[PDB]
Enzyme design. Sequence first.
Site, PDB file in Angstrom:
ATOM      1  N   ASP A   1      -6.397  -8.515  23.090  1.00  0.00           N
ATOM      2  CA  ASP A   1      -6.683  -7.290  23.832  1.00  0.00           C
ATOM      3  C   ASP A   1      -5.560  -6.264  23.724  1.00  0.00           C
ATOM      4  O   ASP A   1      -5.053  -5.771  24.730  1.00  0.00           O
ATOM      5  CB  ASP A   1      -6.968  -7.610  25.301  1.00  0.00           C
ATOM      6  CG  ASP A   1      -8.249  -8.402  25.485  1.00  0.00           C
ATOM      7  OD1 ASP A   1      -9.340  -7.792  25.449  1.00  0.00           O
ATOM      8  OD2 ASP A   1      -8.169  -9.636  25.663  1.00  0.00           O
TER       9      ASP A   1
HETATM   10 MG   LIG Z   1      -7.264 -13.338  27.473  1.00  0.00          MG
END
Ligand SMILES: [Mg+2]
Lengths: 44, 137, 65, 114, 88, 351, 127, 142, 138, 100, 48, 56
Positions: free
Chosen positions: B4
């Site tokens: 992310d």
């Molecule tokens: Mg994660």
Amino acid sequence: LKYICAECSSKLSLSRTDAVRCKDCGHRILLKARTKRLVQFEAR
Amino acid sequence: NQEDSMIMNQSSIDRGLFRSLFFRSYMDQEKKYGMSITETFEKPQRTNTLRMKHGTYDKLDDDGLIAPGVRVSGEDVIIGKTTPITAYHSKRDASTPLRSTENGIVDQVLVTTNQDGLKFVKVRVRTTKIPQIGDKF
Amino acid sequence: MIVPVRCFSCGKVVGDKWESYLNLLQEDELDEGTALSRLGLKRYCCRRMILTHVDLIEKFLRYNP
Amino acid sequence: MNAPDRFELFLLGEGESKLKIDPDTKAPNAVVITFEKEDHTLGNLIRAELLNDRKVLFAAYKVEHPFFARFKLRIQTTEGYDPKDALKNACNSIINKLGALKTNFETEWNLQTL
Amino acid sequence: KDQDDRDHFGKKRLDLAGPLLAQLFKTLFKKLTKDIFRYMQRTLAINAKTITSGLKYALATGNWGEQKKAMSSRAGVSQVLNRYTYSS
Amino acid sequence: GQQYSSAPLRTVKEVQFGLFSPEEVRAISVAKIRFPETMDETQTRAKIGGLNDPRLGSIDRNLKCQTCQEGMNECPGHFGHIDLAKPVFHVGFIAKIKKVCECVCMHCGKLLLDEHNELMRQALAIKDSKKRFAAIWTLCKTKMVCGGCGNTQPTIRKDGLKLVGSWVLSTEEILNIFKHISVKDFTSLGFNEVFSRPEWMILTCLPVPPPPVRPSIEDDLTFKLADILKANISLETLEHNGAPHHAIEEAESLLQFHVATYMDNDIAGQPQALQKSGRPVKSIRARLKGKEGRIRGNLMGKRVDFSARTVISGDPNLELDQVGVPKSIAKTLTYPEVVTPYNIDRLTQLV
Amino acid sequence: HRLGLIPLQSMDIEQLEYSRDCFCEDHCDKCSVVLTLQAFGESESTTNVYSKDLVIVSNLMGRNIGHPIIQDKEGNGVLICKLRKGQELKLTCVAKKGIAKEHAKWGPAAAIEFEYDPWNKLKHTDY
Amino acid sequence: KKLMAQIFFGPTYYQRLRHMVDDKIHARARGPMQVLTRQPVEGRSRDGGLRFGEMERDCMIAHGAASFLKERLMEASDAFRVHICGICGLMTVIAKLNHNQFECKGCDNKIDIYQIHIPYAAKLLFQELMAMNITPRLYTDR
Amino acid sequence: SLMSCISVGTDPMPIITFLSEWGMEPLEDYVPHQSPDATRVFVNGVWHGVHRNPARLMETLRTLRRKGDINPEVSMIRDIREKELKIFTDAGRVYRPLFIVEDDESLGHKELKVRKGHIAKLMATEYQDEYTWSSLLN
Amino acid sequence: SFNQFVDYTLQDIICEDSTLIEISFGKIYVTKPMVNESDGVTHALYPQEARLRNLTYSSGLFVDVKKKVFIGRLPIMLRSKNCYLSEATESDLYKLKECP
Amino acid sequence: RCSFEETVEILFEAGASAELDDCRGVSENVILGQMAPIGTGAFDVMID
Amino acid sequence: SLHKMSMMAHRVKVIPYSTFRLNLSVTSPYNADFDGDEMNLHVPQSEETRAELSQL
RNA sequence: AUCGAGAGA
DNA sequence: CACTCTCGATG
Ligand SMILES: [Mg+2]
Ligand SMILES: [Mg+2]
Ligand SMILES: [Zn+2]
Ligand SMILES: [Zn+2]
Ligand SMILES: [Zn+2]
Ligand SMILES: [Zn+2]
Ligand SMILES: [Zn+2]
Ligand SMILES: [Zn+2]
């Protein structure tokens, strides 16, 4: 030094021991004027 | 760009992608007391004022305020105010320093009396923030 | 705010095409696609750059200060 | 705030030389050259041009970290053939090809309209 | 017939600015008329700062019910308007 | 650091808990606390000979502090003491005391069952103090009649901060009782010889905590001690002068209340003793109760120097055991490296 | 920023110099091109400020340089700003020789289309 | 060179959130302490320190790193030197330094005195317990 | 949610008076054994008595609300099988707008009361800027 | 909710609960948001000026008393009936430095 | 035991029963700010 | 810091920009992504303690 | 600094 | 019973 009123195009020069309000207006919102010493900008 | 995180095109960043204006307001006010004791907005000298700040006051004017347009950074003094409590050092410093971590340009200084007739000031500093490694999107 | 001077992605100048775009929409009564096409905005990044823009400055100018 | 200056991508720092030629301890007759203030633009090109030289056994470039504008170029040549000469021949070959490319593009441009 | 549903939204109410200011103002005005009763029995000089500073306090601190920390409305009834984004 | 001391540096090996005997309390104190006034006395930036004495610790960035000097950074804290007009109860021991009154009959001061009994021989055989006390308390609170002195031991129950009797027990009475339990009976129910006695649980005179415990920017402890001294002077005034029957008792209960809430402010008793600002006030008990307490918040863990914190990101070109550190942080965080012949050049360059 | 992004004539840029390389103080005529901008709201309507309003002040001394590119049909160029009625913009711009590697504003090219082997006969791509 | 796999590529509306690194980044090496506990203050704006909490302590215990634990809890925080009476074992000691006059009213001790290094928060705790009629007597021998 | 609103509160007294003047037997005059199938009427949690033939009453009330004679924020719950009628004028009730479905359509079936003509009038008001939401409610 | 509180609830709070022994409280009057300055001059207060000067956007309450009088200041919700901005047009809001 | 849940009452009954703390516990040396008998500190270092 | 692998000794590499940069394969024991996660760093102040870090 | 509120993982 | 930044009113 000098200041400028908020809701009218005026140019007050009242220093200390004066402050509010404005010349021919009546409101107490005063902004300070821009500096004379120019500031540069790296156009990036 | 794993776990992310993302990669952003620096060239588009240069052209103004996700740039932002960040304004910040500091508010100060002259205190009042029963025996007509009043704090004043001014640019104090080191020989007449106690404590003082480690930052410089050279960007202050006679009214103890910065003129909008001046660049400020580090622990610069934005608002200069003193509080009295012959004798040497007759004033205590109550000046306001620019945020230690932040920096920018004095966008607009507002001077106005209060409802109780107190001269108080709001100084707005502007800083353009450019997307950097670690910025949350 | 105001129409971005150049397209973020590729770098094509688009700040000179805003008024022309508005005219192409109101004067010639074209749709956004054809208007963007006639302005030489073939790549959809620039196409976006103009189509997606909101001219907020026109409201900013409504204040007197 | 912690971002380095942009010119540090192409402007040589204090004491930083353009090329740093180092003897490779792994394989004999090999060398590793550190190119400063350069990226894939020069690295990939020189590396690709070094694979044309049939007297070059090994040739590979790498950018160890995208933060810094620099890359290492490892070259291994045959015995009786200095690797610096291989790099020089590669560079000169590149320059010649680019000169021819420029000339051709120019003569092709003059024959156009609009 | 089974047990009543205590999570039924239809049997619940949402008190807005109206009811809250109503409770608060009932309190402050009862305090005011009490004070006025005292000034009356002491004998036009009505302390208006009660309602004013009361309302102002409860709207500023978010602690609904003047200055008594025994209030269970310490969950911040009034909050600073979030103006980071129009949608916000 | 600080300064050279002639005393040898030793490590704490044992911690002996116990109670504060009034004798040791007044013997330890360096200042008597008569005046409830804080600092200023008739427009004077000083310290009155009552609360916050310069003997307890100077507080004005001076070079002097109760003869010993050593500024106010080196000086720890010098305790004071205040004598109460009448003895009061320690809140945290309200239960324990209430149990001791049920293990020993009144007037006399002897255990109910001895070695003559069969079950008491089994209860007093336990070496563990807590288990011994727990075992004896259950097999002694059922006794009504009684060494002689066959007095009918009353049924004692809890009510606020006093104790009653069923055939009201004064604090002075319980003091006189615990003063006559003697040594041999102390070992039979947990208490120690010269460390902790039931006659020390009740508060004859209480210690006064130094200014480093209650700093001034005044602290809540200063206000509470001012309240205790207020109720104390009030009680003394009501005692020496006109002393009504149903008036001085209220002052006794008031002093008892303030002393009880000075330590523990979260009791079953609804009066939480608020302050001038409407604050429930911060007792000594609340200061220690985690996780924001002293133990869990300042001892088991605490904020430290030479620390940094930042948003993290992944980097394919860093080794497993490496960490990317921003230049600004690297400039901020530092390491003390002693100058050696090995590194004098490098350190000189760094400087 | 918007001023930085404005395309200027860079024909004879090779006979201009980098400010960092020039032996002058700050900037001069051999390394930089100075051009001013003075705009003021005059009409009751919105007064537009374009790149054409930029006025060269420095001495170009022969070199074809500094002139803001105007591919606009009406001859205005990039819309720099908008003024109201009493609003004013007074500023001075120093343009310096630069590389797009340093900042994208010095990018001479837009998008470069690039494609080899349209039939994937080399199989550099698994569709 | 071409990429083998083709890429999902196209416009998508992204937004910039309020959390930016330069507003988060924090580092302190010996800064302003508090007055009550004499420990590093709380906050990035006040140049404060970061809490070496209970769980971190647990981790360092699991590691076996004792000296690091002590360093985090003394030198890197609130390291204080106190004097302890050899008799009762309390902080009643009046240490008149520069004169070597270690007095102790209550036990008449001038020659049998000790000196220990503990956290200032520990000293605070002990003082508060003493103010709560409890004697945390500190002996330095087994 | 976007269209959810909160009841501001209104006076229940005129609704009470209406109920009493429309066949609602007073609770003090209620005898369960002689009228078991009597729908008991509630107002703000108050049992104001029972009512036989509740359908007519409910249609009347609903018609009054939809006309505007009864404040549109007032809720009216008719529980058939439980034989109850609960009217709430209570404030703080969260409600929401809904299209009304009726089967008064002769040459048709059950259709929305709102028609394309209404929509045309709405968008006419939108383009011009007299037919607003309040006119949809009334 | 606020409009309901002002136009109805307030009068109920004042009238239906308070009476002393006599002085009976009559009608309640709610003015437009104004400020009594230190200068002494009481004047109209607009929201922007209120936010700039750290003032409180509140109106005054005046009750009729038998046998008129100011009893305090009620904070006014913006864009409510007693708010100046409710009747204001777009151009008015722009002139008042209030975002439309 | 005071460094968990019931804190103050534990210290109270500890002071009431005059308990002896061996200080060979982890948290106890944590409080005292001393090198606890943990891993590295589970022994002593001398010279020979 | 749930387990001992939440605190681990790393070798410093001073880098530009304002982020703690770590190897991907060290993500799992820390349990950390890079969607705004923040981490702390403690610097040893003597030889024996940095020895503790480097050896334990 | 002491109490409430928003939010970050 | 279970690390941060922050805001904003209070003594
Ligand atoms: Mg994660
Ligand atoms: Mg995460
Ligand atoms: Zn004016
Ligand atoms: Zn594009
Ligand atoms: Zn001292
Ligand atoms: Zn007896
Ligand atoms: Zn030059
Ligand atoms: Zn002693």
